[PDB]
Every structure is written in structure tokens, then in C-alpha cells.
Amino acid sequence: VRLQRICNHPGLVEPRHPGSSYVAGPLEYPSASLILKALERDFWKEADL
Amino acid sequence: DVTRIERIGAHSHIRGLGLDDALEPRQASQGMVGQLAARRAAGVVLEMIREGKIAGRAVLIAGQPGTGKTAIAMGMAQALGPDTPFTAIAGSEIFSLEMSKTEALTQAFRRSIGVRIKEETEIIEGEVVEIQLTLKTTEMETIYDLGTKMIESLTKITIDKATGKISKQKRKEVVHTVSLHEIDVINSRTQGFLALFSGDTGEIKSEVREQINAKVAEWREEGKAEIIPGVLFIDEVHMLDIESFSFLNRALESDMAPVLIMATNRGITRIRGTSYQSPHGIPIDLLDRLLIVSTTPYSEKDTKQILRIRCEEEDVEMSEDAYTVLTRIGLETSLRYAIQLITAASLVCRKRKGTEVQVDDIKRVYSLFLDESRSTQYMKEYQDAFLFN
Amino acid sequence: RIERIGAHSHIRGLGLDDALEPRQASQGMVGQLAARRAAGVVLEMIREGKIAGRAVLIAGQPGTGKTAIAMGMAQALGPDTPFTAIAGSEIFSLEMSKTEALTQAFRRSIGVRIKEETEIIEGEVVEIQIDRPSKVGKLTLKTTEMETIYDLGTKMIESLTKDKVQAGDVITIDKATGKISKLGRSFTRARDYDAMGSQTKFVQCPDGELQKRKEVVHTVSLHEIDVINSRTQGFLALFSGDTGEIKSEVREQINAKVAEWREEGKAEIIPGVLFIDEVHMLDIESFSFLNRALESDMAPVLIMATNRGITRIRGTSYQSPHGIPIDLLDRLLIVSTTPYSEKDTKQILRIRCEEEDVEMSEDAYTVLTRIGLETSLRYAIQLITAASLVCRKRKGTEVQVDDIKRVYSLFLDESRSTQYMKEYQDAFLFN
Amino acid sequence: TQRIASHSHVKGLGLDESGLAKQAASGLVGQENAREACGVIVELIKSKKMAGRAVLLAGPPGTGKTALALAIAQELGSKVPFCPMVGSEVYSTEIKKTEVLMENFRRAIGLRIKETKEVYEGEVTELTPCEISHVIIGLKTAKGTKQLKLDPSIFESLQKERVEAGDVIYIEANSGAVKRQGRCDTYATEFDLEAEEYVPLPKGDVHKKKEIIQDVTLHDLDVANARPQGGQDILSMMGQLMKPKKTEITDKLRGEINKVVNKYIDQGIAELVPGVLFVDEVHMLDIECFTYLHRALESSIAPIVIFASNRGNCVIRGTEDITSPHGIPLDLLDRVMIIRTMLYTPQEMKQIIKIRAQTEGINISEEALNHLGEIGTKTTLRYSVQLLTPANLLAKINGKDSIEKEHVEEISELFYDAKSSAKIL
Amino acid sequence: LLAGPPGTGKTALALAIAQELGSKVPFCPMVGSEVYSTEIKKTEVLMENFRRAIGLRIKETKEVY
Ligand SMILES: Nc1ncnc2c1ncn2[C@@H]1O[C@H](COP(=O)(O)OP(=O)(O)OP(O)(O)=S)[C@@H](O)[C@H]1O
Ligand SMILES: Nc1ncnc2c1ncn2[C@@H]1O[C@H](COP(=O)(O)OP(=O)(O)OP(O)(O)=S)[C@@H](O)[C@H]1O
Ligand SMILES: Nc1ncnc2c1ncn2[C@@H]1O[C@H](COP(=O)(O)OP(=O)(O)OP(O)(O)=S)[C@@H](O)[C@H]1O
Ligand SMILES: Nc1ncnc2c1ncn2[C@@H]1O[C@H](COP(=O)(O)OP(=O)(O)OP(O)(O)=S)[C@@H](O)[C@H]1O
């Protein structure tokens, strides 16, 4: 039976599968919320340039 | 066994400096043997690093090749722990097409200073499946008002009480230590944090660095942040230029400067980028700012103890006669060569269906693999066959 | 027209018989019997495409004909097999490394022959009706043998509307993609309207069945596949040369898929020839890369030409035979070109005269071959054209010895220029 | 058929069970000591627990160093990553040579990651969006019909692929990848001529979850995370238009990927297959590269590194006056185990010539083999094996199916070796 | 130019000058190695550092609601 299946088509015994990429979860970079508040500078110290 | 990303490297046996509370080095401890004076100096330097009060102190570990300078550096790194920054580079890594040598050194310096920020978040949420919002928990049951649309995604968990941030039972506190380099790469672009991974940072401007230094000083004064000074390790510092050394001179004079550890294994040689001869390949003006710790060549028993520690690190059992033969080999050729003979002889014994490394195994590995001296001699014998003599 | 009379225009091939024996003068190719025979053996090896990464060096004195041998090999190889010719100086780019440029040159020299079974319907349009408010339509096509009425789906209607098909157009339609390609306007319908329009030129009605299947062969190079697969719109870099350091893993994937295609009957590999002219301009790093680039099964046959002898290897202070390191020289076979005799020089001059279409007397041939032996072959070859122009100015038809002497006096060779310079050595700068 | 290269005859080290080298086996003859040492190194790579171990193949050119490295590769098999490299490849125009070395180190460490693949495939029965947080899509297979609530990303990829209805699609949930592989077969009979291709409807389930093993290297993860290509947000889309330059991947990305890989190894969804990095012509590396290799080999993550050099007392490149044994700094030679390759006797050269003749499908007479061995003794081994193909070509021209001595003589006269050419120079 | 052997207080004197001027006056510190940049020419680096050693003080009456 197996030999007959192979004779009919080899895709019956082992299909060709789609080739796929490995999906890696995004890297989570943790940091303090105060870091993003850097370079903000104080209102009432910033003039109109 | 399962092979993890971290395998048996050269310095895997070193768990730290084997130092007493008085900093006196134990003969063998934490994977380090000998180098008593150098280990004591590394201990006092490590206490200086831990105290973190004096900025920009530079230490040079000098000695013959294979005397454990890099081993002392890795022991210092292991003793320091993961919470204080320890930046390790080779002198070659500052020669970049993305940035100048000055910029590479500046980044390495700012990767060694860490700012510690602790934040109070708000988290109470728990066991809820219902929809509008009321919450129920083994000890709590509550109702919350809402006037925005974020709940649609929340349907299909825990929220921030202040801003309503949504994400899949008390306030809880989080500590984040961020290096100065991270701070100025995050704030150099709109998505500059990506450059912390791709390396496409390209010469952060001095303006933003000045502003970030000012803001970090402000945070320190206001109590929001505390500075965790680290240590920058430059291995093979003789690969640096005269320009790089001159930059290091004044880079170490900032109050935001880490502790600098340098390793070099050469005598009076040419400074790269110049025709001048200096004691360590380092200009004398930089050596002026350095405390130099010298490593002594290992004795026979120190070599045998290192071989024992490396064998038990690699999980290979040798006979005593094999230990003496291998110690003789190490004293005759080099310590690294014997360290590698250990693994090769374990493999040869394994093929033999044996369990313990014998003298015959070490002889076989000695025949198969050559040291520099024997290969150089066999080369001299075939001098003409080799190319470009 | 854009191809004028180049230096090697007369070279139509290697001029060898079936035994690979060189005929004295054949295919614009005089002398160099042993070198030409070696080139023929190498050409056979290239045609077989069985052994990969083979290197040959053509070594000889300047003007002995190494580049002519290479051009003859290219001509005898034919347009179908890839033949990339570069100068060693071309691998020094600001876009990429020397190793990257050499890899690209290697992969330009390998050709991938991709045969696909298409199913096209080709016929003469004798009727097309499109109803539009989904659109409806009907299309009748005919060959010489049969006619069929097609009920059109919306996609096919859109394709026809975009391609503006009328009655009298000869079109081919791809059954898979529905692409419409129109081959012209047909014998029967032909003339078209009684409106503004333009002139007319007509093609024949196709014969046989409308659907004829048919197998088409598409040829690419490994470099093209690399460039297309590297940059998501990297195809335009095949013209701009803006492909910087294609990743090694991408190339490994290309190689694996090409081998897979070959096993599965889709692709056929055509190993070509990479010709590095003036290979002494490569530095030691480039030679070291060449050493191992020739170990791959996707490596072409490498032809190198150099006139150096006992010369410094670029990037090093070492002296080696051809300016090439001895380790690479052991990887290749050396074809030596001997200097030219009086009669070989005269024959080459006659061939160049024929190529440039200049008649010249036998006295002129004697004088010019003497000049070529004394000065150089190339200088005499240029005197050919110069003397023809002088004769035409004189309003003659045959170039005489007097014209040759006139152009000898007008245009100098290196020896005489160097002498006149030596006399006035102080007047020239930085002596 | 397959093309014959200079190393196609090497199929292994030809070592028996005890590791002793058979005189001739697996396409290798002689170099028994070097082959035995390479067998020990093969066992080292298979042991898998030692990192940053380097070996140096030292010997004059022609002695088979690259052949032994590829024999090691054959012994390991395609499973273990074997990254071949030349010293000239470090000099990149985009990234620093240290980065090139680190990338090659990272792609010699291989990962086999088992991944669950979520597949939606079927005929699009309906496609209804909801303001744009939703797309309700009906998918029909032979098994049955299902309608699924999918993200805006999948919907907008569906719009990219232009799937309307009756179209057979293939959705990978993990990557958000949509493939419109054609229209359903039931609609072929609609029209005599339509401008699309019809595909039979899928015969499996609409929602299929499949466990597959993916072969990747640490460099693949580094490059993917340093040049992100997933995600559909506009900011990343506009970054995809940049020229894909190689960037100097930071140690932080590599540490993060190390953490991720360690987590995978703990979870049992990945296995590490550390391989070998082969740097041929290592003498081409400059002093900076060697001094970086000092550190790169101390890493607990480093692969097994194989170096090959044929130079005798060459100046170290970049040093301009420092002569070291193999063009390699002494401090690096202290870190390597040197395997020496010796020159070949006439008999070993004759055996190698016969093996190359067999691989190239060339019949050579005993007289021709002896003459070619004599030539190789006079010229070099490489020269002799190169004469075989031209000699066979001449033999076919003469109409003979074997290489006789006269053909070898003819090819010897037509072509020259480096020594004859140098003589005429 | 502060000329003298190493360790004789040249940098200390420059920093003392900076202190005597106060943060009001812009003090731009630099190393001669900083002129070698992969992005701009040494002349541009020098010109920029000249630019940032001249300070500008803007007075504004900022109204807000
Ligand atoms: N700190 C040190 N203390 C004592 N000897 C040293 C020290 N550093 C180097 N040496 C000596 O210097 C020798 C060579 O050092 P290397 O670093 O290998 O090369 P090098 O010192 O730069 O010498 P060259 O030939 O000038 S490049 C060693 O074998 C030691 O004998
Ligand atoms: N059979 C031949 N073999 C070689 N050269 C020929 C032959 N027939 C004609 N030529 C001449 O070869 C010239 C090409 O330039 P040459 O420098 O003389 O030779 P070449 O082919 O360029 O090789 P090199 O590198 O210059 S020595 C043409 O102008 C011809 O006059
Ligand atoms: N012992 C051997 N048995 C079989 N083939 C060999 C042997 N040694 C060398 N070869 C081969 O002979 C040819 C020349 O050797 P290669 O290994 O390619 O060059 P190489 O001399 O090893 O390179 P290096 O680095 O200069 S030693 C190749 O086809 C090799 O496969
Ligand atoms: N006159 C001084 N009084 C007090 N401290 C000083 C004096 N001169 C130098 N120092 C300090 O001594 C150390 C060495 O002097 P530096 O100022 O760093 O060197 P420099 O002379 O300024 O520059 P160099 O070394 O000549 S290139 C520093 O910590 C200085 O602050």
C-alpha cells in the first residue's frame, strides 16, 4: 500500500511544505519613564528663539 | 545535559576575587589561584569602585602573557555583580566606520555610568471576566468609572490607576538602572532606542550629552536618581592610538567618569600612530594617571592548582602523574597550551573508553597538537616551503 | 554604429580547426600558435562546464596579444555563455569591499537558465465587444485554422481595456497572468480606421491552435538573483551598481535554491568566464580571496592577463613572478605568448588594414612592418589610420611609403619622444 | 550534473573507530597526523561544551589545510553550522572588521527552534470590516466554513494582497503574512477567458497549528532584531526604504538575544548546535583583528575556530615591521593548538592525482599517471591535477577514452607552472 | 598656550579660569583628538567648537494663560 502511494505521487507520503520565516517576538527594552523626560527643559526657562 | 548559550570559556572557572574581608587573597578561592599581590590590588580597586566616590581612576594590569590579567578583570567583574555597570571592550573595537575613536571611547565611558531610578506604579487588578467597570477578587470588589474608549481592546489584564494605561494587587515599585549612553541614545532620535541594538547611533552630539549630564545632576540633587558608577575594562589597550590615549587623558577627568581598567602584555614598544617608544605602548602622560598592578609568572604549584581548577571546571579527572606531566608542559611551553591539552586529552581518553586522563593521553595530545615553539622550529626546518619569509 | 573599429575588432575568434590546431591566419588571428591552442583547450573546458573554479593566466611581453587572445575566446564562446571582462582596478570601489566586488564579478559569470512552461493564447482579434454599466464582454480570436469566441471575465476585460485591443490586432494572452502582448496589426483587418491615425505596417495571422502551451527559457546570472533578492527593490541596483555588501547568508540561500531548481528540472547552470585584465593591479588581499573563491562549485573559469615579470605584489613589499602571489600562481595554468616575427607583424598589419578598409602598397607594408619591429606593433597599427588620413588629404587611394614616413614624422613613439625629452630634460617638470 | 571543484573528493577524515587515520580513505591520502588531530577536533565540536577553542593549520601551500577543514565539515554534517571565511573578508566598507568577525562568530552558533505555526487557509466567503479594529473573514475548506475576527494588520495585508471573495488565501497568524494564491476552482467554469489563476480550495482545516523545527543562527536573530522587518507600523515601514546597510550590532542586542535563547533552551523549544568558524588565509587579518580575537575567544559563547596559514615568517599586517611565525601574533599563537601539515611524497601525490582523476571522470593510463606524478614532483601537486582535464579534452579530440602519456606531454608543453614562467621572466 | 611638562597644572589653570568666569560665560572644553570625526571634516569640527564658545543670552517677558 505504501509503495502504491509513493508511485501515485510522493506528496502522499511526504508533502512539500511552505518555507517560512521564524517569527521572533519583539525585544522588550525596559527603562525608566524619567529617561524620556530628559531634554525636556523647564517651561519658564525656554525663551522664544 | 542541555547546552546553554553560556559554555565553558577560558575564564568560566573564575567566580570572583578570592579575597578575605581584610582583602587578603586566599591562596585558592573562587576559581583564582596565586597572583596574591595583583589580587590584593584588584580588591582595593574593587572597594574603590564599590564606594564610588572618586571619579575617573585608572588602573593598569601589566605582566607577561598568560599571567592572568584578563582573569583578574573577569574576577573583578564577577565580584562586582550585575547591578553595577561593567563595560568590557578590546582596544580594537574603537576603530569603527560608524564613529570616530573619540566617539567610541565616549560611548564606552557613558556605558559604564548608570542612573538608578525607582518608580511607584499602581496595580490592584485581578480575577475579573465581566464587562461593563466592576472588579471582583478573593479579597476585593470594586467599581471604576470610565469615560474613554480604551475598554474595547481591554475586552479581549491590568491597568494603571493614574493614566489608564492598558496592559494584559498593590502599588508595587520598579527599579531601572540606565546608563548615560542609553539615555543619550534614546533622546538623540525619535526612535533612538533602536540604535542601542543596531549600533546606528553615529556620533551623538556634545550638546545633548551636556544637556543629559545637567539633567542627571538635577535628578541626583532632587533625589529622583542616584548615580551607579561602573568600571570600563579595555583589554589589549596597546591597540589604541596616540589620539585615543590623549582623549582618555581628559575623559578620565569628568566627575561622570567610570573606573578604568586596562590590560597590556608588552614591554617598551611603539605607540600606535607614532614612532615613539613608551613602556607599555602607552604614552607616559597617560601612565602618569595610572596605578599599575604587575602580575608575577606562576610557580609550579600555582600552575598545577590552576590546572586542577580548570580540570574540575571542565569535569575531567586526571591522574596525579598526568598532572605533573602537564605542569611540566605548561612551565615549558605555556599555561594556555596545557589548559587546551586538558580538553584534548579528555577527548582522547573518551575515545579510548577510559575514565581518567593518563600520562599516555597527554603524550598523545602533545604529539598531535604543537605549541608555538615546536611549530616555529618545524617551520625553520621547512623554511623555504613556507611563504614570504 | 555605436560599435566602431576597436583595437580588437578584427578578432572574430581563435581561428582553430576541429583538432584545436591553430591556422596561421584565421578569424582575424595571426600567429601565437601555442597560445591560441591553449586558449582553445581552455575554451573547450569552459564549454563543458564540468570543472569549477579553473584559473588560467596569459603571460607575455607587452603587445604580444594577451587581450586579443581573450577577445577571441570571448567571440568563440558566443553570446550565450556569460563572459565578464574587468580590469583589476575596477574592484576598488567606494560602494563595497574588494572581496564583495570580486564575489559580484564571479557571480556575474555564472548563468542560470530557467525554463518555464507558459500557456499563451495567440490569435488575430476579429471582434471584441465590451459592455460597461461589473463589465461584460466577448472576444473572438482566429488563427489560420480556427476561430473561438471568448466570454470575458472582469480581470480579462480590464487587461484588454488597458492594452486597448481592437479588431485586427495580433495579441498573445497569458493564461496564468492574463498579460496582453500585441505583436502588431494583422493581414486581414490591417488598415484600421478612416480617422487621423498614422501610417501602417502589418504582421501575419498566427497559425495553429489558439492555446499552444510552449516552453520559454529565461536566463539570469547569480549576481542578478542576489541583487533582486537582497533589497526589496534591489533590482534597480542592477543598473546603478548600488548594491553594498550583499549578505553572505542571502548568497548561501541563492546557491541552495539554485541547486534545488537544478535537481527539480527548472534551472540549468551555465558556467561562464571571468576575465581580469591587468590582474597585477589586484592586491594581496584580493589574491587571497581569489584563492578560495575558486574552491566553490559555483565558480567560473578565470582568465587573467599580465605583462609583469618579477614585480612587487600590490599591498606588500614582496617580489613574485607576475605580481601575483605564488600560492595563487600554483592554482592556475600559464599561457605564454611569444614575441612576433617579421611576417606575423606584416600579416597583423594587413588584417588591421582590411578591418579599417585601407589599401596600402607593398613598399608601405615593408616600411610599416620595419617600423613596428623597431618601435612596436601598436604604434604601427595607429600609423595605419594616420597614413590613410594623410593619403586621403593628398587625395590618393593607396597609402604609399611617403605617407607612412609623413605620419612617422608627425606622431612619435615612446623611444623618440623619450629621446627628444632627454635632450630638453630641464624644461620638463619633476624629472 | 554536479560541478567538480577542487575539494569535491574529500568526504571525511578517513579515520577508523579508534581515531587512527587510514592511509587513504574518504578521499584523503597522507597527512595522517593532521587528520588524527582533526578527528580530535571533530570530537571536540561534537562534545559541544567548550567555547572559544581555536586551532591553527600550519604548513606550506598545497598540503591540504583547506581540504582538512572541509573534511571536518563533512564529518560534522550539514546539521552543524560550518561558516567558511577568508581573512580578506573582514575589510568591509560598511562595518568595522571587528563587527565582521563577531558576525561570523555568531553565525557559527546554530539554533533549532520548534515553533507552532498558526495557519488560516480557505476560500474567502466574506470580508466584513468593523470601524477599523476588526475584519470578519469567512474561510471555506473541504472540512467546513469558519468566520474569524482578525486584527487590522491582517486585514490591511489582505488589502495589500487584494483578496475579495472566492479567493483562496493563506494566512500565517504569527507573522501576519497573507498569500493570495489564486481564485477558487469552482469559478474556473464562469468564463471562457479570465485573467487569473484558479487553485483548488484547501482540503484541511481552516485553522491549523503545526510544529516545525527552524534552523537559525544567533546572527540571524541579531540581524533580524537590528534591522526589524516585522511589524506594520508606519515608522518601521519608512525605515524599510533605507538602503539595507550592515550595522555595528551592539553587545546589548547580543546579550538580549542570549537571554532570549537561554529562555528558549530552558523551555525546551530550542536546542543549541554550536558549530565551527573556518578562517582561511588568517594571515590576511591585521593586528587589530588578531587582538580582537584575543577577546572573542574568551567568550563563553564563542564557537570552535579553525585558522589556516601557509606563511613562514611574514610581517604581521598592520604592524609594518613585526615578524611573527605564521603571520599571526605570538599572543594569539599562545591561544591556539597548531596542527602541522607536511609535504607529500611522490607516491602520495600520485594517489591524490588518481583520486582527482576519478572524481573528474577521467581515465588515465599507468604511464600517464607516472609521468604526471613525475611532473608534479618537479612542478607541484596543484599543477599536475590541473593538467588532467585539458589532457582528457585532448584525448577526446584524438578520439581516445583515456589519457595517454603523449596527451600529458602536449598539455605540459602548452601550459606552464610558476617555476617555468619565472624562469622565462 | 599653556606650555610645560606633564602634571604642571595646565588643565587645572584652564578650569580655574572657567571657575573665575562662572557658568555665565560659555567654557567649551575640547581635546585635540576630537577633531577627527567620521561625519564632518576637522575644519568643520573646529569651526563648530568656535561657534559654541560664543554665548548668547536672550531676555524675554514670557506671558502665559
Ligand atoms: N608587564 C611586563 N612585565 C614583564 N615583562 C613584560 C611585561 N610586558 C611584556 N613583557 C615582556 O615582553 C615580551 C613580549 O611581549 P609581547 O606583548 O608578546 O610583545 P611585545 O612586548 O610588544 O614585544 P615586541 O617584540 O616589541 S612587539 C614578553 O615575553 C615579556 O618578556
Ligand atoms: N593572432 C593575434 N594574436 C595577438 N595579437 C594579434 C593577433 N592578430 C592581431 N593582433 C594584434 O593585437 C592587437 C591588440 O593589441 P596588442 O597589445 O598588440 O595585443 P593585446 O591583445 O592587446 O595583448 P596585450 O595585453 O596588449 S600584450 C591588435 O591591434 C592586432 O593588431
Ligand atoms: N591529503 C590530501 N588528500 C587528498 N587531497 C588533498 C590532500 N591534501 C591536499 N589535497 C587537495 O589538493 C588540492 C590542493 O590542496 P588545497 O587544500 O586546496 O590547498 P591548500 O594547500 O590546502 O591551501 P593552503 O592553505 O595553502 S595549505 C585540493 O584539491 C585539495 O583537496
Ligand atoms: N598648582 C596646582 N595646585 C593644585 N593642584 C594642582 C596644581 N597643578 C596641578 N594640580 C592638580 O594636580 C593634578 C595634575 O595636574 P593637571 O592639571 O591634571 O595636569 P596639567 O598640568 O593641568 O596638564 P598636563 O599634565 O601638564 S598635560 C590634577 O589633579 C590637578 O588638579
* Secondary structure class of C205 (helix, strand, coil): coil
**C239 lies in which domain range?**
6-110+221-340
In a domain, B348, yes or no: yes
The residue of chain A nearest to residue E56, with distances taken between CA atoms, is: A49
Q: What nine digits make up the cell of B131?
A: 464587562
Phi-psi sector, B151: left (phi>0), alpha (psi -120 to 50), beta? alpha
Measure the CA–CA gap between D186 and D123, rounded to whole angstroms.
10
Nearest to B219 among A31, A33, A34 (CB): A34
Measure the CA–CA gap between C141 and C148, rounded to whole angstroms.
6
End residue of a domain, out of D186, D208, D224: D224
- The CATH code of the domain that includes D402 is 1.10.8.60
User: Within 6 Å (CB) of ligand 2, which residues are found?
Assistant: C 7-8, 29-32, 60, 62-68, 305, 307, 348, 351-352, 377-378, 381
In a domain, B267, yes or no: yes
C243 and C75 Cβ atoms separated by less than 8 Å? no
- The CATH code of the domain that includes B379 is 1.10.8.60
Q: Give the ligand 4 atom nearest the CA of E12.
A: 17
Measure the CA–CA gap between D53 and B370, rounded to whole angstroms.
14
D123 and D147 Cβ atoms separated by less than 8 Å? no
Same domain, C244 and C289: yes
- Cα B65 to ligand 1 centroid, rounded to whole Å: 8
Same domain, B292 and B306: no
Residue E61 distance to chain A (closest CA, Å)? 9
D312 is in an annotated binding site: no
Number of domains in chain B: 2
End residue of a domain, out of B298, B332, B359: B298
B64 is in an annotated binding site: yes
Q: Which chain B residues are Cβ-neighbours of E7 within 8 angstroms? A: 288
Same domain, D295 and D200: no
> D393 and C45: CB-CB below 8 Å?
yes
Same domain, D44 and D149: no
* Secondary structure class of C369 (helix, strand, coil): helix
End residue of a domain, out of D224, D244, D274: D224
In a domain, B127, yes or no: no
> B211 and A34: CB-CB below 8 Å?
no
Measure the CA–CA gap between D166 and D124, rounded to whole angstroms.
5
Q: What nine digits make up the cell of C426?
A: 630641464
Same domain, B335 and B364: yes
The residue of chain A nearest to residue E59, with distances taken between CA atoms, is: A47
Residue B388 at interface with chain C, using a CB cutoff of 8 Å: yes
Q: Which chain A residues are Cβ-neighbours of E62 within 8 angstroms? A: 44, 47-48
User: Within 6 Å (CB) of ligand 3, which residues are found?
Assistant: C 327; D 6-7, 10, 27-31, 59, 61-67, 308, 310, 352, 382
Residue C328 at interface with chain B, using a CB cutoff of 8 Å: no
Phi-psi sector, B166: left (phi>0), alpha (psi -120 to 50), beta? beta
Same domain, D378 and D328: no
Q: What is the DSSP string of D50-112?
A: B-S-EEEEE--TTS-HHHHHHHHHHHH-TTS-EEEEEGGGG--SSS-HHHHHHHHHHTTEEEE
In a domain, B119, yes or no: no
> Residue D405 burial (CB < 10 Å; 0-12/13-18/19+)?
middle
- The CATH code of the domain that includes C62 is 3.40.50.300
Is the shortest distance between the CB of E10 and ligand 4 below 6 Å?
Answer: yes
Measure the CA–CA gap between C385 and C381, rounded to whole angstroms.
7
Phi-psi sector, D399: left (phi>0), alpha (psi -120 to 50), beta? left
> D2 and C139: CB-CB below 8 Å?
no
In a domain, C125, yes or no: no
Same domain, D11 and D103: yes
> B387 and C316: CB-CB below 8 Å?
no
Which of B70, B11, B87, B79 has the alpha carbon at shortest distance from B45? B79
- Cα C292 to ligand 3 centroid, rounded to whole Å: 12
Same domain, B213 and B303: no
Measure the CA–CA gap between C144 and C131, rounded to whole angstroms.
28
Paired sense of beta strands C311-312 and C319-320, if any = antiparallel
Residue B189 at interface with chain A, using a CB cutoff of 8 Å: no
In a domain, C364, yes or no: yes
Same domain, D287 and D425: no
**Pocket of ligand 2, candidates C8, C27, C368: which has the most ligand atoms within 8 Å of its Cβ, to mutate?**
C8
**D150 lies in which domain range?**
108-224
Same domain, B256 and B328: no
- Cα C28 to ligand 2 centroid, rounded to whole Å: 11
- The CATH code of the domain that includes D214 is 2.40.50.360
Residue B287 at interface with chain E, using a CB cutoff of 8 Å: no
Lookup result for grid cell 569602585: B49
- Cα D288 to ligand 3 centroid, rounded to whole Å: 29
Measure the CA–CA gap between B324 and B127, rounded to whole angstroms.
66
In a domain, B169, yes or no: no
> D115 and A27: CB-CB below 8 Å?
no
Strands (DSSP E) found in E7-60: none
Same domain, B354 and B288: no
Same domain, C404 and C285: no
Number of domains in chain D: 3
Task: Determine the residue type at E51.
Answer: R
Give residue C305's Cα distance to chain centre.
Answer: 17
End residue of a domain, out of B298, B329, B361: B298
Which of C35, C7, C36, C75 has the alpha carbon at shortest distance from C273? C75
End residue of a domain, out of C305, C340, C375: C340
Q: What nine digits make up the cell of C172?
A: 498573445
Same domain, D322 and D356: no
Same domain, C300 and C384: no
> B183 and A35: CB-CB below 8 Å?
yes
The answer, yes or no, to whether B and D have at least 3 beta-carbon pairs within 8 Å is: yes
- The CATH code of the domain that includes D285 is 3.40.50.300
Nearest to B347 among D40, D272, D291 (CB): D40
Q: Which phi and psi (to 5°) does residue B119 adopt? A: -120, 145
> E33 and B246: CB-CB below 8 Å?
yes
> B365 and D40: CB-CB below 8 Å?
yes
Same domain, C350 and C274: no
Continuous H helices in C84-176: 98-108, 154-163
Same domain, D230 and D103: yes
Same domain, B294 and B305: no
Same domain, C105 and C226: yes
- Cα C340 to ligand 2 centroid, rounded to whole Å: 10
Same domain, C389 and C281: no
> A35 and B182: CB-CB below 8 Å?
yes
Residue B167 has a CB neighbour count (10 Å cut-off) of 10
Nearest to D113 among A17, A22, A26 (CB): A22
Same domain, D85 and D134: no
Residue B70 at interface with chain D, using a CB cutoff of 8 Å: yes
Same domain, D130 and D263: no
DSSP state of C376: -
E55 is in an annotated binding site: no
